[PDB]
Structure 1
Amino acid sequence: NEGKALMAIKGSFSNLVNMLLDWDDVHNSDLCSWRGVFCDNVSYSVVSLNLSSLNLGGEISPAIGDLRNLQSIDLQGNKLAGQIPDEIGNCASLVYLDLSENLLYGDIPFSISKLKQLETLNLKNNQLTGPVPATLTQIPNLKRLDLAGNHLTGEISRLLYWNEVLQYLGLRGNMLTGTLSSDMCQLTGLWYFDVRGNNLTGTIPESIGNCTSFQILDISYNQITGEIPYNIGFLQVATLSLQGNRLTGRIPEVIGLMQALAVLDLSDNELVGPIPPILGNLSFTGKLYLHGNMLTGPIPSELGNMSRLSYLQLNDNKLVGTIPPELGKLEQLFELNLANNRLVGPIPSNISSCAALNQFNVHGNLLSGSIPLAFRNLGSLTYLNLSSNNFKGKIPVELGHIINLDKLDLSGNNFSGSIPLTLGDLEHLLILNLSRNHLSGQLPAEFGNLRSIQMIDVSFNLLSGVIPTELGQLQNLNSLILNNNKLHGKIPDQLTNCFTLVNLNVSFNNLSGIVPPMANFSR
């Protein structure tokens, strides 16, 4: 009899051939062997149905309610459309319902409130519309509510927050309006609060300090205005994501007392004022994201006292003054991004102490001086952007021994002297841009050993000589931008052997001859 229900369930899966060949009523008669059907060994009744990621494509049959003993349903990853049937509320013993990663739509059914044993309601990543209904506050022992990635509208009723049992509250990426309620502090057993990416307005409640059980608080990418209340200082969260709203005022110095922070994201707001130096008391914080505000003042040297910081992004603010040598202390810094401020002075040499640094971006400042040679000690560097500053001197030869550089951008400075041949040793380099400098001497033929290179731009220097034959070897090069130097000679014909080359620029040199018939003008 339960097999009749299972046959209707199969009869509404669209694209299926050899998928549930197990479900063969001609002769595969013990349905407790069928693919994804699990029975308990006492009653021999269907208790668990798992069909995850088989991509069956149809609908959920109402006959799902004919298996009353079902304790678990997992139909995730099946591109199922249609509505969630009401008869789903007839599985009175259901503990776990995962309908995520499908194309279901319409509202969350009312009958879901009939499932008093339910612990996990997982409907993430579908197309469900409608309210987050109040009936889900009549599921006494519900623990995980994942509704993220649907098109839920309406506000968040403060009734939702009167729940001692709820653990995970995931509402990310819906279209929920309204504010955040003070009653939010009644979720006393919850560790995960996530409303990122809705259309929530209003302020941060000043009573938020009462939510001391939160490990993760995400209210990012809404339109929340106001300031960051002092009582933010009482949370025991590891991750505080406030990025992407309209928060104004200064960063509250009480954030300096939140030593449990693992990840602090205040980025892309309208925060003004200085970076509080007390933030260096975050001796344990691994992430600090203040980029995209209007923070002024200097980089606090106290940021060197955050012993465990791995990702520092202070770019796109109004910061002044010097880059602190103190950042030489941050032994775990993987990524430093100070782009687009008003920093002056030279790169401190002690920055070569950051032995594990992967990305150094200081584009768009007023930095000065020369590339400190101690930089050779940064053998982890993948990405170096000093572009759009006022750097002087010769490109350090040692820059060539930074083995795993793949993006090297020094463009828009006053680099003089000659291209160091050691750059040709960067076998992983993908982009080399040295444009808008005062580089002289000749175009190194050792660029012929830039095997990965995709883009070489040395336009707007004083490069003399011929274009080396050796670039004809570069098999992944798609842009050779050499305009506005004083190159001379004929364009070598081996640039025929540049298959992927699709963008060349040699205008405004003193080249001569006819353009070789190695003309791959695909763009």
Structure 2
Amino acid sequence: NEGKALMAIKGSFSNLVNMLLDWDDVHNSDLCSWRGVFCDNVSYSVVSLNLSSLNLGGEISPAIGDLRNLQSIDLQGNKLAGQIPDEIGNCASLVYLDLSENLLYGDIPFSISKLKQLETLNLKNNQLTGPVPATLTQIPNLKRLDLAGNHLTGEISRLLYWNEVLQYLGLRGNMLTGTLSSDMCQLTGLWYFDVRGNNLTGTIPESIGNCTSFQILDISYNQITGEIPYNIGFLQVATLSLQGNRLTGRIPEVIGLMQALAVLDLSDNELVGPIPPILGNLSFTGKLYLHGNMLTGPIPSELGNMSRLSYLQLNDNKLVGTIPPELGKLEQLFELNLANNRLVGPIPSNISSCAALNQFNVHGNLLSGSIPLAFRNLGSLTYLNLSSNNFKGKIPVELGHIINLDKLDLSGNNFSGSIPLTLGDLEHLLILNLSRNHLSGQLPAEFGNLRSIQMIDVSFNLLSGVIPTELGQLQNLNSLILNNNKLHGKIPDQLNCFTLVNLNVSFNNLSGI
């Protein structure tokens, strides 16, 4: 009776009996001992089905409509093709439907509205084609709705926002058009608004300050034009994400009062004007991504009052003036990215105080002066980028004592002297691009100890001497560019570097074959 429907279900699952080896009604009769099926201990009908993450790869047989007491159906990962069967809308006891991570196409079916007990509709990462039907409003207990990862069309009907119990709205990664309706803020118990990745035109609703239920607001990557309203300062969100759109005007000064924020994202927008220094009282935010804009003016020194900051990205703007030394105050800073600006003057020595600094990138500015020596104290640094600047002086010896360095890029500056031998014991290094400089003298043979190295470009320098013989030990180096230098002698016959796929010795003075 019920095993009949379970065997039509299994009947439509590609062609594998290895996985559901269990479902065998002649040598395993009780169906409540089968794999992924569960019967509540009283009525002893199947109430829960969990075939999640097995790849059975057929269809959802309509016989699923014949297990009436199913209140849980989790069929994720199985690569089920075809449409969502209509009969799934007469398991009225159903509470929780996860069909996420499959190859289902067709529409979200009308019969879904019959399931007046349903709480979680998880159709994530499928191929459903067609609109988010208005009838999803006729499920009074639905709390998590996510259609993320589909090819859904049509607009978001404001009817969908008149809903008092909804917790989670996941719409990311469809092709939804239209506007953000100013009735959007009638989802009074929602904590997650996600409409990212669609094609929504229109401005931000000025009446968005009433959305105090929201923990996360993600409208990013959506082609939204217009200004960022003042009432956005009333939002209680912790993740404010407005990235990737066409939001013009300047950064609302009222954002300086949104102290609850934990991730602040305005990046890849066409925002102009100065960086509001009031942001300095956002003492507890983790991320500030103002990059991608046309923000002009200096970096506010009050950004050192963001003590809890861990990810600062102001790159690719039109910021001018100096780097503030107060960035030493940010003791939690992992990634500092001020690239592609117009910053003038030297790197402050105070910045050597970010013991947690992990990425440092100031490529593409007008920075001058020398690397401060106190950079010996940046031991936690993973990624060091100072390319395309007017840095001068010498490469500090103590730079070799930043052990966790795996990407060093000093290209494009006027460094002098000979290369430090301590650069050799950067055991974890992977990329070393010191080119377009004025480096002189010997090519330090300690590069034989750069065990994990991948790409050495010390080209375009005044490097004299011979090519070290130890470079044959580098069993990971796939690009060795020594071009435009002053070296001589013959090439070592040891280049035993089976990884090399790109050598460039040229415009040198070698002697041999």
Q: TM-score range by the shorter chain?
A: over 0.9
TM-score calculated relative to the size of structure 1: 0.98
Separation in structure 2 between the aligned mates of residue 452 and residue 67 of structure 1, nearest angstrom = 58
Q: For residue 473 of structure 1, report the CA deviation from its aligned partner.
A: 0.5
Separation in structure 2 between the aligned mates of residue 447 and residue 296 of structure 1, nearest angstrom = 42
Separation in structure 2 between the aligned mates of residue 443 and residue 352 of structure 1, nearest angstrom = 28
1:139-197 per-position Cα deviation (integer Å, ceiling 9, x unaligned): 01100001000000000000000000000000000000000000001000000000000
1:423-478 per-position Cα deviation (integer Å, ceiling 9, x unaligned): 00001000000001001011011110000000000110000000010111111001
Q: For residue 21 of structure 1, report the CA deviation from its aligned partner.
A: 1.4
Separation in structure 1 between the aligned mates of residue 391 and residue 19 of structure 2, nearest angstrom = 64
Report the number of matched residues: 513
Separation in structure 2 between the aligned mates of residue 306 and residue 343 of structure 1, nearest angstrom = 21
1:196-250 per-position Cα deviation (integer Å, ceiling 9, x unaligned): 0000010000000010010000001000000100000000000000000000000
Separation in structure 2 between the aligned mates of residue 218 and residue 334 of structure 1, nearest angstrom = 24
CA RMSD of aligned residues (A): 0.5
What percentage of aligned pairs have identical amino acids? Answer: 100
Q: For residue 106 of structure 1, report the CA deviation from its aligned partner.
A: 0.4
Q: For residue 16 of structure 1, report the CA deviation from its aligned partner.
A: 1.3
For structure 1, which runs of at least 5 residues remain unmatched after alignment?
515-523
1:360-391 per-position Cα deviation (integer Å, ceiling 9, x unaligned): 00000000000000000000001000000000
User: Is the partner of 2:447 in helix, strand or coil?
Assistant: helix
> Equivalent residue for 1:226?
226
1:33-66 per-position Cα deviation (integer Å, ceiling 9, x unaligned): 0000100011000000100011000000000000
Separation in structure 1 between the aligned mates of residue 442 and residue 20 of structure 2, nearest angstrom = 68
Separation in structure 2 between the aligned mates of residue 20 and residue 434 of structure 1, nearest angstrom = 58
Separation in structure 2 between the aligned mates of residue 404 and residue 345 of structure 1, nearest angstrom = 27
User: Is the partner of 2:5 in helix, strand or coil?
Assistant: helix
Q: Is 18-27 or 119-128 further displaced after alignment?
A: 18-27
User: Is the partner of 1:48 in helix, strand or coil?
Assistant: strand
User: Is the partner of 1:432 in helix, strand or coil?
Assistant: strand
TM alignment of 1:81-92, pairs within 5 A: 81-92=81-92
Q: Is 476-485 or 11-20 further displaced after alignment?
A: 11-20
Q: Is 23-32 or 120-129 further displaced after alignment?
A: 23-32
Separation in structure 2 between the aligned mates of residue 465 and residue 339 of structure 1, nearest angstrom = 35
User: Is the partner of 1:112 in helix, strand or coil?
Assistant: helix
Q: For residue 15 of structure 1, report the CA deviation from its aligned partner.
A: 3.5
TM alignment of 1:36-185, pairs within 5 A: 36-185=36-185
1:300-353 per-position Cα deviation (integer Å, ceiling 9, x unaligned): 000000010000000000000000001000000000000000000000000001
1:105-137 per-position Cα deviation (integer Å, ceiling 9, x unaligned): 000000000000000000000000101001100
Which structure shows the bigger proportion of residues in strand conformation?
A: 1
Separation in structure 2 between the aligned mates of residue 347 and residue 104 of structure 1, nearest angstrom = 54
Q: For residue 487 of structure 1, report the CA deviation from its aligned partner.
A: 0.2
Q: For residue 26 of structure 1, report the CA deviation from its aligned partner.
A: 1.5
Separation in structure 1 between the aligned mates of residue 80 and residue 127 of structure 2, nearest angstrom = 11
Q: For residue 17 of structure 1, report the CA deviation from its aligned partner.
A: 2.2
User: Is the partner of 1:47 in helix, strand or coil?
Assistant: strand
Q: For residue 22 of structure 1, report the CA deviation from its aligned partner.
A: 1.0
Separation in structure 2 between the aligned mates of residue 178 and residue 112 of structure 1, nearest angstrom = 24
User: Is the partner of 1:59 in helix, strand or coil?
Assistant: coil
Separation in structure 1 between the aligned mates of residue 210 and residue 129 of structure 2, nearest angstrom = 32
Separation in structure 2 between the aligned mates of residue 34 and residue 294 of structure 1, nearest angstrom = 61
Separation in structure 1 between the aligned mates of residue 85 and residue 256 of structure 2, nearest angstrom = 50
Q: For residue 18 of structure 1, report the CA deviation from its aligned partner.
A: 1.4
Separation in structure 1 between the aligned mates of residue 479 and residue 2 of structure 2, nearest angstrom = 65
Separation in structure 1 between the aligned mates of residue 500 and residue 401 of structure 2, nearest angstrom = 27
User: Is the partner of 2:259 in helix, strand or coil?
Assistant: coil
Deviating 4+ runs (over 4 angstroms): none
User: Is the partner of 2:217 in helix, strand or coil?
Assistant: strand
User: Is the partner of 2:261 in helix, strand or coil?
Assistant: coil
TM-score calculated relative to the size of structure 2: 1.00
Q: For residue 19 of structure 1, report the CA deviation from its aligned partner.
A: 1.0
User: Is the partner of 1:411 in helix, strand or coil?
Assistant: coil
User: Is the partner of 2:288 in helix, strand or coil?
Assistant: strand
Q: Is 5-14 or 19-28 further displaced after alignment?
A: 19-28
Q: For residue 410 of structure 1, report the CA deviation from its aligned partner.
A: 0.3
Q: For residue 277 of structure 1, report the CA deviation from its aligned partner.
A: 0.2
Q: For residue 27 of structure 1, report the CA deviation from its aligned partner.
A: 2.0
Separation in structure 2 between the aligned mates of residue 506 and residue 4 of structure 1, nearest angstrom = 74
TM alignment of 1:302-313, pairs within 5 A: 302-313=302-313
Separation in structure 2 between the aligned mates of residue 107 and residue 54 of structure 1, nearest angstrom = 24
For structure 2, which runs of at least 5 residues remain unmatched after alignment?
none
Q: For residue 405 of structure 1, report the CA deviation from its aligned partner.
A: 0.2
- Residue 55 of structure 2 is aligned to residue 35 of structure 1: no
Separation in structure 1 between the aligned mates of residue 240 and residue 121 of structure 2, nearest angstrom = 25
